[PDB]
Amino acid sequence: IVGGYTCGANTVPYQVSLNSGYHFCGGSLINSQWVVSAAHCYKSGIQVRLGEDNINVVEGNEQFISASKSIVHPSYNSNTLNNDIMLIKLKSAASLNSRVASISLPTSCASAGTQCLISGWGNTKSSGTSYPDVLKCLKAPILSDSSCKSAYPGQITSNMFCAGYLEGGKDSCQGDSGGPVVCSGKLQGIVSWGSGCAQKNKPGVYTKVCNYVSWIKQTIASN
Numbered sequence: 001i002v003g004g005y006t007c008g009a010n011t012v013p014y015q016v017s018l019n020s021g022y023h024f025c026g027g028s029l030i031n032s033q034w035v036v037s038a039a040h041c042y043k044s045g046i047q048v049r050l051g052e053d054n055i056n057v058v059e060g061n062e063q064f065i066s067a068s069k070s071i072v073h074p075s076y077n078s079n080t081l082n083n084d085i086m087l088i089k090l091k092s093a094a095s096l097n098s099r100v101a102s103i104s105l106p107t108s109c110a111s112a113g114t115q116c117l118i119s120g121w122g123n124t125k126s127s128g129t130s131y132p133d134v135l136k137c138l139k140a141p142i143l144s145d146s147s148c149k150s151a152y153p154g155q156i157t158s159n160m161f162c163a164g165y166l167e168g169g170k171d172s173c174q175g176d177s178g179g180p181v182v183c184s185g186k187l188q189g190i191v192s193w194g195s196g197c198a199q200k201n202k203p204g205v206y207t208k209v210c211n212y213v214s215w216i217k218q219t220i221a222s223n
C-alpha cells in the first residue's frame with residue numbers, strides 16, 4: 001500500500017497473509033473454512049496466516065492453517081486478468097473472536113464514489129521498494145466505470161472496477177495482490193492489477209466480487 005497508514009494490530013480481522021515460506025499475497029476470510037483471494041495468487045503449498053499484524057514476529061494472535069484445496073475461477077484468464085478470483089479451503093476451521101473474523105459478501109454491487117478500505121503488506125513505494133512488516137491501510141473511493149476505462153483503454157471488463165486517486169500517490173501495490181477492498185462492511189473487491197503503483201491516471205484495478213457471490217456460495221456448499 002502506497003500512501004496509506006498503519007492499520008493497527010488486528011483492526012482488519014478478515015485480512016489474511018498467504019505464506020509459502022514467505023508472505024506472497026493477501027486474502028480475505030469469508031467463513032471459518034474459506035478464504036477469497038486473487039487467481040493470480042495461485043500456487044501449491046499455501047499456508048494461510050490469520051490474526052497477523054507484524055508478519056515477521058509472532059505476536060500472540062496468529063492462527064497458521066494449511067490450505068487443503070485451492071479453486072481458481074473456472075473462467076480465469078491470466079493474460080487479461082478477467083475473473084481474477086480464487087477460493088482457498090483451510091484444513092481446519094479458524095477460531096473466530098474479534099481479532100479473527102470473517103467479512104460479509106455483498107448482497108449488491110457498490111457504486112462509484114463509495115468509500116472503501118484496502119489493506120495489505122505490499123510495497124509502500126511508488127518508485128523502488130520497501131515492504132512493511134505491519135499491515136497497511138488505505139481509504140479510497142470506487143471510481144466511475146467511464147474513468148476506469150479511460151485510464152485503461154481496452155482492458156476493463158465487467159468483472160473489474162477501479163478504485164483510488166487519479167492524481168497518483170495512493171494505491172495498492174505488489175504484495176497486496178489478493179487482499180480486500182471492503183466498503184460498508186462488505187467485501188466488494190480483490191486487489192488485482194494496475195500499471196505500476198500510485199501513478200498518475202493509473203488507478204488500481206480490482207476484481208468485482210459482487211459478480212461472484214453465486215459462484216462462491218455454490219462452491220463452498222459442495223466443497
Ligand SMILES: [Ca+2]
Pocket residue numbers: 052053054055056057058059062
Ligand atoms: Ca505475526
